[PDB]
Amino acid sequence: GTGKTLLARACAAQTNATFLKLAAPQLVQMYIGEGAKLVRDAFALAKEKAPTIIFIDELDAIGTKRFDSEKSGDREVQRTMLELLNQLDGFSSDDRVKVLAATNR
Amino acid sequence: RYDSRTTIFSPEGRLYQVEYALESISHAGTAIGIMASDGIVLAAERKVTSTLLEQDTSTEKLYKLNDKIAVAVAGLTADAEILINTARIHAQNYLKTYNEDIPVEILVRRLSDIKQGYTQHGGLRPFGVSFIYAGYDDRYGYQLYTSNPSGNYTGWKAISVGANTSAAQTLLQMDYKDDMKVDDAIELALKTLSKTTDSSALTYDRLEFATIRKGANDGEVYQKIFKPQEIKDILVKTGIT
Amino acid sequence: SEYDRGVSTFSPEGRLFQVEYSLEAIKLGSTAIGIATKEGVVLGVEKRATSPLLESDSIEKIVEIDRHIGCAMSGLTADARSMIEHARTAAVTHNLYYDEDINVESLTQSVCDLALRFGEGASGEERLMSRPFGVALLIAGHDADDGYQLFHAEPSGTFYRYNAKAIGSGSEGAQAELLNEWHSSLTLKEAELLVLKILKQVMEEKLDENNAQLSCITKQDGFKIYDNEKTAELIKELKEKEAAE
Amino acid sequence: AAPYAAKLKQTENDLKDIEARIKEKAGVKESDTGLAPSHLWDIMGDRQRLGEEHPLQVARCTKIIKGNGESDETTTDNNNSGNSNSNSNQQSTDADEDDEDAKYVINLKQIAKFVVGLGERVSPTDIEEGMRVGVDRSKYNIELPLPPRIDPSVTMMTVEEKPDVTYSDVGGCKDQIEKLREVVELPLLSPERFATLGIDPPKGILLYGPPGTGKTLCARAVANRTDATFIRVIGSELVQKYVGEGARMVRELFEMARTKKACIIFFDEIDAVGGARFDDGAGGDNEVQRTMLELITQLDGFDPRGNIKVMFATNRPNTLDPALLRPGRIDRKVEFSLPDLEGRANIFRIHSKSMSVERGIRWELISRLCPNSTGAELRSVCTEAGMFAIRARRKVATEKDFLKAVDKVISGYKKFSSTSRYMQYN
Amino acid sequence: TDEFNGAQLKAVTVEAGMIALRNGQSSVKHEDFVEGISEVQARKSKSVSFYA
Amino acid sequence: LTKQIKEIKEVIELPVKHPELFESLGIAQPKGVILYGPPGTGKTLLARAVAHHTDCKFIRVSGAELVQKYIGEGSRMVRELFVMAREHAPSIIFMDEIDSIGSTRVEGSGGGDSEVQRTMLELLNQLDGFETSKNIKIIMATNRLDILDPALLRPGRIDRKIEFPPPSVAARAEILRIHSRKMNLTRGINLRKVAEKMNGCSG
Amino acid sequence: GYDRALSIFSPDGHIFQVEYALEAVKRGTCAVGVKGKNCVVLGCERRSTLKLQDTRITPSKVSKIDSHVVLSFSGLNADSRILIEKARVEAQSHRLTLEDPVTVEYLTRYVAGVQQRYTQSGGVRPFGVSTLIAGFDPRDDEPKLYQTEPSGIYSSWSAQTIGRNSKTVREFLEKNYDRKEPPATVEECVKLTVRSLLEVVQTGAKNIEITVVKPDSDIVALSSEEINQYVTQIEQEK
Amino acid sequence: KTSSRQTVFLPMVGLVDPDKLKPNDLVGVNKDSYLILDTLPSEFDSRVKAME
Amino acid sequence: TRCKLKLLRMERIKDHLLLEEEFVSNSEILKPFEKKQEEEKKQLEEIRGNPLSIGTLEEIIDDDHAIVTSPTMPDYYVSILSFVDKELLEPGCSVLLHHKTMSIVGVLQDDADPMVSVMKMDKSPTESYSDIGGLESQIQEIKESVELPLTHPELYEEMGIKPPKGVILYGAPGTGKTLLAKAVANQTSATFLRIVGSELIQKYLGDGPRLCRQIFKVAGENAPSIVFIDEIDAIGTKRYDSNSGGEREIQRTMLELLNQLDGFDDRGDVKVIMATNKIETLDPALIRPGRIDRKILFENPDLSTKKKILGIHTSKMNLSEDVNLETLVTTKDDLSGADIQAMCTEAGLLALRERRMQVTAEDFKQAKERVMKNKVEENLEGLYL
């Protein structure tokens, strides 16, 4: 409720970059195949239509620090979150394809 | 739980503190007091023994609080210490004031009141110590009592507190006869103490003993502690050693 | 919650829920009704028995605080022994100091001063009572200067003057009846039968003098707690009146 | 021992005879299934059974493809997708052309997925996502479409239109009931005022509370008063949710209300189905999460709603998604709570109204003695008092009969703490 | 207010226009906002001094 | 442990050999035994000695049941405890569960506790029965009663509780006697010495 | 949780300590008081546990406050102990100040006042004892039987049972007893008091304890032999 | 991983390329013989919609 | 001797005749008909192959088809055809399918399943009209709720009230709550369902909610009925396992139970009985009052109540002249009714111990001290003294 979402869409639209939304609370699944698969679709899109700002919601459910939460496909989302950061170095640095991210704890 | 303090009761109105304090007495050794027609014998058990431990300087569970009434002790000994002194001081306060020695019932009543008083008010702890009061007063002649750590007293012709309370109680009452000779009172004490106790060889150093008589040295209440060499003999008469 | 474990701890409403709760202790105790008139205040009560072995003729719940100041109570009686004790002392110390009748209003304040005490200390009133009072009083009396007055002394709040007040268990339905049946035209005999009339309505018991007790403050008759015959007579008149109707 | 001994063996043989008697009996039962009007059904019955024409497997679409642009030929194409309408019509270096579209990928109820063609009865406008489709025993291909999911006919039961409930069948004229009126009726009559103020008119409400208050009775009450037709879904009575079955449960009834005007979509008891997900939990479910994702978007889409109001009752607000708790889905929140003295008077008066009892009783008199309570407990005092009354053989339950009934529920409360008080003499 | 985040702040203002609409007004005022706050909380808006 | 040898004979053999006598003379029939006391006392072996003389089934059920799944599940083999006990009656069942689970789940409630609660409780139903008694001699073994769950502990649907003692001087001597024959007999006889010297804490 | 102090109340206005104190009474054995026309008999269940235990040196359940006031109790034995000596002194302090034999009203009101004082306080529990305080006065011939409760509330009742399974004993007493006719003779007062106690003892005619108080400072405690004639008299009529 | 509850190792198909087989691709496998037949699009859910 | 002969006079001749009668009649049924019915049967057997795969009917589409879900993994659109009607079926009923090509060829089941078999019982009740004394009052509360609507519905109509639905028996073990329900059931002559609530639950998933449905479904076909779901505690708030293999099962199964009890209508014609240890082993709200009337708390026999239980036992055992009835009560202190039965079993074993044929004085005295020793506390009088 502190308007991260608000600023972020406002920042994207100013820079002449597209606002890719990655709905972190909707992407929750114990589905191992369908969990891994859908994340990469969202990224691929963002790259193509670059400049872009990806805004990634709550990290309290797609990549918990603690494993005393039962997760098996959100485990696989967590591994894909690293792969995204590596791929922003696909133009040198990360300037063209930038990522903002939000967490509440 | 509602064991946080004395003030607070459970749904059922019992107080856990009292309960713990009863259990404290039975984690220190058996103590047995027998009243007989011809004397009241006190006998107690040593919970401690090391090979280099000495116990010949003092009895750690027997104190005379007055020259006519003495107590055998069951419970934690630091707790015991404070109260032994409070009772003996109160005894002589009676002697100062009335120029005669304290009746048994008053003496017990005073300490259970103090002990209850710690439950009734304040932050102070209850003090789980059970004294077996063996005394003589002209009110009811020989009198053997014990005090509860629940802070009330009951008269007796025998009582056992300390370890194996159930075991000591049935065994004593089975070989009770309304009369009882003071020699048999001694003989009985030793026999029930061996069975209860997990040290197979009951030796004189595992024993504390006093016998209290006005049938010996008439017109005078005389409490006499046995020495080791006397305790050593009686064990051979009971056939332990 | 969490604001009912401190007596110096306020709720996020700014209130004390230790105190709030003591209002429900007042409501728990049995109904008391007072009705002031221009001729005197008539103070009636409810009692309850479970056995007929209860001596109902030697129990107090209307108490004499002076010979012209009386009170009814409702709530915890453990608290009430103390409350009524303080209030006796004040009336007596006034005549000690002054040789003149205490004021009804003045008495009302002093009572509420003892009520304020919830902990210890505090300036200008050294506090010695350790918990919330669980007792309210309907305070009725007479000083000349303000005539006959009825107040309800509220330990939680402070005193509110009433021209008629019901407290206890049956308070909500009584208050409405007492709106429609307090007048500036009440007579003392009529007030007496009025109190019984309201009591019965909210009493799920039997109306009898064994669980009722009228009393008046009339400054010319003194404080008179009534007899069993006297109250019995008022039960009888009540029934003939409402039979015709 | 001759009196009992001899008679013991005799007892025993009879029991054994009885056991044997039951196995003789059950080996023959009542003849057969033969019925003269279904002996004529037998004429058609031989032909179809021997023919290849039943059974049809139940499958259901789970994934839509477009049958060109799919990437079926893979010769000189790239990726997993083509041009999304062509893939073999712009090039014959594949060496093939095909003009098949809307092929669709089904799932069997054995959990095995297959792509199938289309019959002679099928066109792309007879098939959709989530619609049952019948396929062969052997080599598969859609023959006849079956209607979507198992939801139809089961939902209609739960929906009652135009309730026979008003604010006479609800006791108390409670605070929540006064805020409830403002949500449904006030912007329906006049959307002018809301527009001018510059607030967006209330249309979301969440009724929530402890059990037994009667959050539902009110909700029904106003549905009739506003004179709107009533559509009910109960998401803890209706427990179809499997792979977005409950999203089809939601869609139909919302979709139906939307075609009509002057409607109430009451989503009830959504603690499960369209409620909290159990990915986080040990349940592993996210089958109720499809139901959730659909529910949000239906609301959001409908907006401005043309004065058709979406209502919610859920027991706990802890079983809701925080997207619902953003405005434009839910706008008003009412916790139902214990009725006041007179409110409890009123619930007693309705219960008592149905009874045939002595009229000299006064409703206020009984509810005084009663503490603060739920309506469901005051239903219990009247039913209990009825039972005491017949037992004593009165055809009426006196004021006194209801005081005994009140007392027994209370006595139970006393049993769980401690009994006896100071109120036996005060 | 104190410790009201973005979402909450909007909740009181929108709420305060509803309240005003019921009263007979067709515009918001200062007092009505105050009333919006007393929904977030369980405080009574108007109660006599004898506990508050 | 003579006391125990005499009891388990009276309690188990007499109702099975003749049911008529126990019903004529007393009333009802015992539902079993709860054996408790120190571990090491040979409860199990003693009970195996009972099972052999009566000419009864055995089984012996080792621990909690979930473990067998080769056909079905172990939750329903408790249901089948009835079917098996009855057909092959006369049976003794030496049902084990030492209860090193503890007093934690005597109170509990919660956790995965409900399954083992179920296994224990539903076993209980078959014995007392809703008509017919399958077997009257299902037999419980455990180290203490405080660790024992209360449905099972509560008497009158399980009968008889017998406590083994930490062995006497007399008991030690008699246990010592039977094995020393198998061994070698000491010259001068020093079988007397051993029992004097110490009394074990178990058998 | 509001049963942690006497300075915290529940939303119903109770201090559960008092409520749990009433359950504590029930642990202690029953006591029964019944007045007649010219007496009060205060009778009680006594306990005989073992041959070792005595009676001489083993506390009575009746303690005499003075020569014209008597007191019975039920509760924990330790708690009543401090209360009785305390009660006795208060009783003496009446005469010290006023120089008159102790009033029974004065006595029930102060003694429960000690209880009340403790309950009022939040830092200390009060007692868990309910008592009967019965008596006469040399001036007043009216027989009085009073009650205390652990809240520090005193009440007066014609006849009462308190203690262990009191409720059941109560219902029997209601019926026989009338406020219009209490027992005329002393012996008859005793017969009823015994009939009530038979119920709580099960069997035990050494376990029924009778005391009688009449005006002009007459307190007697009945011999074992005398208590026994009633029991046998009640079995012949039974 | 088949939708016939196996996991199987199949010699690679000549028309399908090693470029258009990588982890998590959805694929046709021929029903008559398990050899890798064709390539299917990716499946989507209601969660994906929101992301666009 | 004379009256047990009279039981033999009534039972032997009537019963023995009944076996023999069935046995000839099985032949005799056949002989009246020799065409028509025989013919129709003959062609039913040609049509219906061997074996038949079981089905379960989900739903009927009105056009001479239906959809079944079968223990065969894929579902089927089957047809309704041949010796079956559209209205001879109802949804959710079990149907018989043709092996080769699935078709409903009729029904001979109609809710015939193994869980139905466990649930229905043909057993004799253990108690009949409170054979064993004590709890006189508690049975005159079950009876008001359960037995009384079945026996006379008219009395509730004059009263103008709806008639009760169900009872909840709870509290203490050894008080014979599970046996009072059996007593009440024999008194009416109602249909009794001993199903146990714990017999729906297994490791394997997804089976359970079927079982919950079937209970309410069968109970309504044979209504009037009394349903006893004994031990509904295990399926309470609690969980199967803290790992896996049961996170779902308890949650679905309980919820599904509340639903079809309410969904009948608020009936006073199918009663339920929930037997439970406490409400602390279940969820804090059930389904939750006005609807589940009445709740019966069992507590320990009092001196009157435990006398009554005892008098029954002692008379069926040799002697009572030795030790008075009263002397047994006096010695005992208050306990459940199992403890009273336990003293009598031990007494009988003690007569065996001596090798007597009389329950002597010595036997009574020991048997009383034994039970008290189990089952012991002494800090009630230790706090006090």
Ligand SMILES: Nc1ncnc2c1ncn2[C@@H]1O[C@H](COP(=O)(O)OP(=O)(O)OP(=O)(O)O)[C@@H](O)[C@H]1O
């Ligand atoms: N307002 C009321 N007027 C009359 N009776 C009432 C009222 N509220 C509840 N009751 C009684 O309680 C019964 C059951 O509760 P009801 O269906 O009203 O409650 P709810 O809290 O909406 O429930 P659930 O948790 O079952 O959805 C009603 O059938 C009725 O007899």
Ligand SMILES: Nc1ncnc2c1ncn2[C@@H]1O[C@H](COP(=O)(O)OP(=O)(O)OP(=O)(O)O)[C@@H](O)[C@H]1O
């Ligand atoms: N009374 C005896 N006579 C001879 N041997 C004995 C006796 N009692 C115990 N033993 C021996 O002591 C050993 C330990 O006993 P065992 O393991 O059979 O005990 P348990 O008390 O039934 O155990 P658990 O609690 O593990 O079920 C064995 O070697 C056994 O043979």
Ligand SMILES: Nc1ncnc2c1ncn2[C@@H]1O[C@H](COP(=O)(O)OP(=O)(O)OP(=O)(O)O)[C@@H](O)[C@H]1O
């Ligand atoms: N009113 C009564 N009806 C039936 N038996 C009774 C009655 N009162 C007491 N009993 C006694 O209680 C005994 C114990 O009954 P039982 O052990 O079956 O108890 P339960 O409460 O149903 O138990 P569980 O919790 O073990 O399922 C009966 O055998 C009988 O002696």
Ligand SMILES: [Mg+2]
């Ligand atoms: Mg956001």
Ligand SMILES: [Mg+2]
């Ligand atoms: Mg509802």
Ligand SMILES: [Mg+2]
């Ligand atoms: Mg073993």
Ligand SMILES: [Mg+2]
């Ligand atoms: Mg049972």
